[PDB]
Design a protein around this ligand. Sequence first.
Ligand SMILES: COC(=O)[C@@H](C)NP(=O)(O)OC[C@H]1O[C@@H](n2cnc3c(N)ncnc32)[C@H](O)[C@@H]1O
Ligand SMILES: [Cl-]
Lengths: 112, 115
Amino acid sequence: GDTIFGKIIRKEIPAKIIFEDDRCLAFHDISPQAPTHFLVIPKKHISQISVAEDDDESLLGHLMIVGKKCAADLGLNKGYRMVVNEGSDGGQSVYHVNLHVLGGRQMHWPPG
Amino acid sequence: RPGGDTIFGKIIRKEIPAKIIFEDDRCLAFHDISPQAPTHFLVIPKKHISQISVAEDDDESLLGHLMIVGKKCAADLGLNKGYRMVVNEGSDGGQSVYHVNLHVLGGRQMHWPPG
Ligand SMILES: COC(=O)[C@@H](C)NP(=O)(O)OC[C@H]1O[C@@H](n2cnc3c(N)ncnc32)[C@H](O)[C@@H]1O
Ligand SMILES: [Cl-]
């Protein structure tokens, strides 16, 4: 089923967009957990990483490359953390695959 | 040397021990020595890349493969309630081994924020 991230891709509700191409969208998280906290999502509706297909490998890697490029553009020269959450135990909040990128502060261990 | 001389390069070449879950021509999945969850493993490329910030555009398929292998290993390990994947960059990310590594953590409720 559709999610709020689908609405964001479709431009039906606003988001602070950082980057877009034909296959993904990066935008600041509405509930940021670090001074910089953004998401990179595919335009293809993959509901969760556990159901991603082998043919999705380059698209998933594209999310990470876009994420690291956006992190550099946003000035995260001291580092950052990338996160993908799966399911209940993973704390996944939206059933549309989304890569979190967090920085601008020390990230701690364990990662939740 | 193929894989570099970080401890992960040593693990790739079987020069120091590891508890391996899965291995192919592109990557290796093995359990973390300091687990932060009941199940906590790493997926690393066999190609040495020091950190995600220096990955090349042509590394997209390899990076995605780490995630596909991670999710397949999580299923094979029975993490049916979910899990969290983590890649750390540099000092603020907490990176400690400069060879790209994807963490997969599960078997308990993970909390927010993720550190
Ligand atoms: C502060 O460092 C960290 O915990 C994370 C955040 N940094 P990191 O660079 O993201 O993760 C490196 C991980 O590599 C694991 N490790 C280190 N030596 C071995 C080994 N010989 N076999 C298996 N796992 C090993 C550590 O316990 C870390 O969790
Ligand atoms: Cl999420």
